[PDB]
Amino acid sequence: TNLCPFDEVFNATRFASVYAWNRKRISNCVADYSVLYNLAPFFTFKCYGVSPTKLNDLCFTNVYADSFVIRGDEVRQIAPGQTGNIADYNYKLPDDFTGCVIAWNSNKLDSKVSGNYNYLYRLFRKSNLKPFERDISTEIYQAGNKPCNGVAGFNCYFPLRSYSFRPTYGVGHQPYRVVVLSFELLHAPATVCGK
């Protein structure tokens, strides 16, 4: 009677940057629902394709827990059919996404008075990301006609930038920890039930 390790994802001490989002593969365990919506007025909670009150009555093949951090103005991009610097170049959700999105203000954890520049995001990419694609590439982005050859110069810029989470910023700029739960159901034996 192994319980699904949901505490390791929400109560994790450090989240990953958005461009290298972490995914915890959860299966063969006793799930739960209550905490999900019942909990308390904590954060954002949006489900797509499934109802939270019905999660306890459904069995799934695998449940994927994606966790990362972005700023406030970008939480709306973690949703099916969204565009933007986060949705197109960091973490894209499919149009037929079946799952829920959870995001809370973690200004008290991930923002320092001198700026917490450890959290990074991708700024330049030649094409859009497919759903559930993780690009950790750090190659010099060629924005011009001449090749870069690993030379940071004109029309050759580094593809990552830092978030600067300072607690004195506006709420649209404060760090937000995001937890995305994907519910998959394919031709397989279902193991992630919650009763």
């Epitope: 197109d88 030649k126 060629q142 006609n145």
Partner: antibody, heavy 117, light 106 residues
Framework: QVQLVESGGGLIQPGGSLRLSCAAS????????MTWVRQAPGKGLEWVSL???????FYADSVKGRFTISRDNSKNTLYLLMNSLRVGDTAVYYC???????????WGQGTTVTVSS | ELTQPPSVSVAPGQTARITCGGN??????VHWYQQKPGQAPVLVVY???DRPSGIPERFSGSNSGNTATLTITRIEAGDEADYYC??????????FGTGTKVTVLG
């Protein structure tokens, strides 16, 4: 070198259509944040539209549903389709390459669009 | 909603200061542009304080709180233009200030 040559301006009746061009040299349009910015005669600057390197487009509230930004990788040229024009849209339209954090460095010479009776 | 003063007036050789105000001006970066008459704008300051290659050291930027500042030292008549600030913050749209005319007193 680096050049942003524009074309396609002129006079056009209200409610009409006009398509603007932005030929690029040295800079590849398909791999850059490309934007259009118009400036009313004697007013400030107003950003209009943009196109991501990945294909996502975004428009201002004043031109939504009426304007359309596109590109052609073979010709390396940025386009701005304009439908259902009014006198409020009469301005000098510029095209520029956005570097986001590093701002809009290279700008076009700008073409003029005149809409009235 | 960027607010810039309508105009500044500085004697030649002195220093100008142009303010650009807004709400929550901390995290977002600021860019500055020079528009001489009949010309396209030219990026003069990017990411608060960086000067791109080839632009005189007289120009300089700063930003904190609710006000960014563009500083032009040792002003000449070649600086007579309009200067606009622009915020980088939003990834889907960009907004400009109302513009500021820096008349060099002739």
């Amino acid at each position: 070198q680096v050049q942003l040559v524009e074309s396609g301006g002129g006079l056009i009746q209200p409610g009409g259509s006009l398509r603007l061009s932005c030929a690029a040299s040295g800079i590849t349009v398909s791999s850059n944040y490309m934007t259009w910015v118009r400036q009313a005669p004697g007013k400030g600057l107003e950003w209009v539209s943009l196109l991501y390197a990945g294909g996502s487009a975004f428009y201002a509230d004043s031109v939504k549903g009426r304007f359309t930004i596109s590109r052609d990788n073979s010709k390396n040229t940025l386009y701005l389709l304009m439908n259902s024009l009014r006198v409020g849209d009469t301005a000098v339209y510029y095209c520029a390459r956005d570097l986001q954090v590093y701002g809009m460095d290279v700008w076009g010479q700008g073409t003029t669009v005149t809409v009235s009776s | 909603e960027l607010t810039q003063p309508p105009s500044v007036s500085v004697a030649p050789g002195q220093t100008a200061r142009i303010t650009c105000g807004g709400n929550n001006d901390g995290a977002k970066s600021v860019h500055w542009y020079q528009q001489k008459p009949g010309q396209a704008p030219v990026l003069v300051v990017y990411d608060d304080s960086d000067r791109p290659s080839g632009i005189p050291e007289r120009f300089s930027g700063s930003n904190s709180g609710n006000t960014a500042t563009l500083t032009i030292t040792r002003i000449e008549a070649g600086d007579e233009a309009d200067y606009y600030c622009q915020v980088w913050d939003s990834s889907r749209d960009h907004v400009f200030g109302t513009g500021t005319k820096v008349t060099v007193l002739g």
